[PDB]
Each structure stands twice: as structure tokens, then as C-alpha cells.
């Protein structure tokens, strides 16, 4: 029974060794997965920061060109209206 | 009267130009709005990511502390089992 | 009195093992919640991106239709202005 | 001369229209370009999330099997400690 008792202590500490080793593999794999996901989030975070920051200068350029475009549009409408008015003048002159 | 035909043509050009300006603005603004929505989405995602990363960095000390406590418990168990085997060997030698 | 030391050591080892299991359950719990939260976040983002990319197609169809309407309105304006010039020349030379 | 400046106004309207089309093509080109860029970024990120989740999901079987084996080793350890306590009560009592 003494031999069996020492055998039981040996078996127990072997089981503890394997349990700790396996749990270390599990923990390392888990933290590895967390690290990969946070890494991907970091990269994406930085790219979005880049695009968000560029939107300011891009919006300034857009506003400049959009003002110039509103100028061209108003000019065309006014040109066509003036055309109509001078045509009216010509027509009433031709009534003579 | 040919003057009436001219007035009709000018009014036609005014209508065409007006619809073209209206459509032009509509296309333009639709594009700008699409860009704005995508930028807003990317900003939300960026802030969520920044929050997760910040929480991980803050709690890293606590996680490492608990892991150290765990490895200490494992080592203590190994030591108690070794002492158990040693004292059992002592008792066996006594008998 | 060495047997009492043996029983005390066995009870101590059992308490140690129980504390290791309790603490390890807290660790595994935290890792599981972290991975689950990040997977939920990335899956939500993946779906939102997929949706925007999916509706970009219909937005491109409407964009194409409206752009064709635009170019037709442009061509029509250029032609109406040319016909206008033609009749203006007709009246001008008629009155000369 | 009211006809000469009518023809002149017609030519001016043609010119203004052509300008407006050029400027608007510039505007729409930079806008559609920005859209293309952000859509390509979202496509890349969507496929990355899909890939990383498909990997975790594919290895969940190995994870679950090693975790079950881990819980098996924990149970084995509690069983061995219990057997030890019992045989040590037996041996202790056989002495006294």
C-alpha cells in the first residue's frame, strides 16, 4: 500500500504538470488571438484617422470650386434672361 | 412673326438651362452626402476601436497581476506535492 | 506526529488546487468576454461595410441614369443656342 | 446695334455653359474618386474581418477539445488528491 501511495503522489504531480502545461498553451493561444484582433483594429483606426483628417482640405477645395460653379450658373441664367429682354426690345422696335 | 419664334426659343433655352442647373446641383450634393455618410461611419468605427485599445491598455496591469497569481498558485501546488512525496518517503523509511 | 503534517499538507494542496481553479476560471472568463466582444464588433462592422458596398451598385445605376439626363440637357442647350443664333442671323440679314 | 449684341450674348452664353461643364466635371471627378477610395478601403477591411473570424471559427474545434481535456485533467487532479487523503487517513489510522 505504501508503494501504491507513492505511485499516487507521482501520478498526481504528473497530472498537475500536464494540466499546467496544457492550460499555458490555451492561455497563450487566447492572448495571441486577442493581440491579433487588437492589432488589426489599430491599423484600421489609423487609416480612418488619415481619411477623416484629409476631409478638411478636401472640403476647402470643394467649397472654392463650388462657389466658382455657382458663379458660372448665375451668370448663365442672367445671360439668357438679358437675351430675352433685348429680344423683346427688338420685337417692339420691329412693330414700327 | 419671326420675333415670336425667337422668344419661344429663348424661353426654351431658359427652361433647359434651369433643369440642367437643378440636376447638376442634385448630382453634386448626392455625391457629397455619400462621402459624408461613409466618413461618419469610419469615424464611429475609429472611436470604438480606440476605446477597446484604451481599455486593454488600462486593464493590462490587472490581467498580468492575476496571471502572476495563477502561476504562483501552480508553483505552490507543485511544491506541496513534492513535500508530500518527501515526507511520505521519510515515513516509509521509518517503517 | 508526522502523519498530521501529511494530512495538513494534503489539505493545503487541495486548497491550493481549488484556488488555482477559481482564479483560472476568472482568467478564462475575462479572455472569453474580450474575444467575444471584439468578434461582435468586427462582425457588426463587416456587415455595415458589406451593406454600403452592396447599395453602391444601385447608387451607381441611378448615378448613370441621372448623368445621361445631364448630358442630354447639355446637348439640348448647346443646340437650342445654335438654332437661336441661326434665327437671329435670319432676322438680322432680313432687316439689312 | 441691337442684333450684334444679341449674337454676342448668345456666344457668351455658349461659352459660360461650356465653362460650367468643365468645372463641374472637375468637381464630380474628385468626388467620385474619393468615393472609390473609401469603398476600396471598406472592401479590404471587410475581407480582413471575414478572414480573421473564419480562422478563429475554424480552430474553435481544436480549442474546445483542448479545453475539454483541460477540464478532464482538473477532475483527475481532484480525484487523485481525494484518493491521497483517503489512503493517508487509512495509513495514519493503521499506525495508531
Let me know: does B73 contact C2? Beta carbons within 8 Å.
no
Q: Which three cell numbers stand for residue A5?
A: 501511495
Residue C71: give the domain boundaries.
Answer: 1-96
Distance CA C5, CA D80 (A): 18
Closest to D19 (Cα-Cα) out of B2, A79, B12, A20: A79
- Overall domain count for chain A: 1
Distance CA A12, CA A33 (A): 32
Helix (H, G, I), strand (E, B) or coil at B88: helix
Residues in C closer than 8 angstroms to D74, CB to CB, are 21
Let me know: does D9 contact A86? Beta carbons within 8 Å.
yes
CB atoms within 10 A of CB A2: 13
Using the beta-carbon criterion (under 8 Å), do C9 and B38 form an inter-chain contact? Answer: no
Burial label, B95 (beta-carbon count in 10 A; 0-12, 13-18, 19+): exposed
The four Cα atoms D39, D41, D45, D50 give a dihedral, to 10 degrees, of 40
Q: How many helices (H) and strands (E) does chain C have?
A: 1, 0
Question: DSSP string of D42-63?
Answer: HHHHHHHHHHHHHHHHHHHHHH
| C-alpha R_g of chain D | 41
Q: Which three cell numbers stand for residue B82?
A: 513534492
Let me know: does B17 contact A78? Beta carbons within 8 Å.
no
Let me know: does D80 contact A6? Beta carbons within 8 Å.
no
Residues in C closer than 8 angstroms to D13, CB to CB, are 81
Q: Which three cell numbers stand for residue A31?
A: 492572448
Residues in B closer than 8 angstroms to C48, CB to CB, are 41
Let me know: does C6 contact B60? Beta carbons within 8 Å.
no
Let me know: does C49 contact B37? Beta carbons within 8 Å.
no
Closest to B30 (Cα-Cα) out of D32, A53, A48, C52: D32
CB atoms within 10 A of CB A54: 13
* C-alpha to C-alpha distances, B44 to A51, B41, C1, C69, C73, nearest whole angstrom: 13, 5, 69, 36, 40
Let me know: does B67 contact A26? Beta carbons within 8 Å.
no
* CA-based nearest residue in chain A for residue D92: A2
Q: Identify from A38, A83, A91, A94 which residue to disrupt to test chain D contact, counting D C-beta atoms within 10 A and taking the largest count.
A: A83
Q: Which three cell numbers stand for residue D17?
A: 455653359
List the determination method: X-ray
Closest to C39 (Cα-Cα) out of D60, B6, B61: D60
Distance CA D90, CA D70 (A): 30
Let me know: does B63 contact C30? Beta carbons within 8 Å.
yes
The four Cα atoms D51, D56, D59, D60 give a dihedral, to 10 degrees, of -140
The four Cα atoms A96, B2, B6, B11 give a dihedral, to 10 degrees, of 100
Closest by Cβ to D10, choosing from C7, C17, C84: C84
The distance of Cα C69 from the centroid of its chain, to the nearest Å, equals 31
> Which DSSP category does D2 fall into?
T
Resolution to 1 decimal place, in Å: 2.2
Distance CA A64, CA C6 (A): 87
CA distance to partner chain C, nearest, from residue A57 (Å):
25
Helix (H, G, I), strand (E, B) or coil at A96: coil
Using the beta-carbon criterion (under 8 Å), do C20 and B48 form an inter-chain contact? Answer: no
Using the beta-carbon criterion (under 8 Å), do C35 and A30 form an inter-chain contact? Answer: yes
Helix (H, G, I), strand (E, B) or coil at D7: helix
Interface of D with B in 27-46 (CB under 8 A): 27-28, 31-32, 34-35, 38-39, 41-42
Residues in D closer than 8 angstroms to C49, CB to CB, are 42-43, 45-46
Helix (H) or strand (E) holding B59: helix B2-94
The four Cα atoms C27, C29, C32, C34 give a dihedral, to 10 degrees, of -80
Let me know: does C31 contact A30? Beta carbons within 8 Å.
yes
Let me know: does A76 contact B17? Beta carbons within 8 Å.
yes
Whether residue B49 lies within 8 A of chain A, CB to CB, comes out as yes
CB atoms within 10 A of CB D60: 10
Closest to C62 (Cα-Cα) out of B65, B76, B23, D54: B23
Amino acid at each position: 500500500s505504501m508503494e501504491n501511495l507513492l505511485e499516487e503522489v507521482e501520478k498526481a504531480k504528473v497530472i498537475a504538470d500536464e494540466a499546467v502545461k496544457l492550460q499555458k498553451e490555451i492561455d497563450k493561444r487566447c492572448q495571441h488571438k486577442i493581440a491579433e484582433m487588437v492589432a488589426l483594429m489599430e491599423k484600421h483606426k489609423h487609416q480612418y484617422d488619415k481619411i477623416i483628417e484629409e476631409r478638411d482640405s478636401e472640403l476647402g477645395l470643394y467649397k472654392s470650386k463650388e462657389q466658382e460653379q455657382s458663379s458660372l450658373r448665375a451668370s448663365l441664367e442672367i445671360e439668357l434672361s438679358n437675351l430675352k429682354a433685348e429680344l423683346l426690345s427688338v420685337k417692339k422696335q420691329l412693330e414700327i
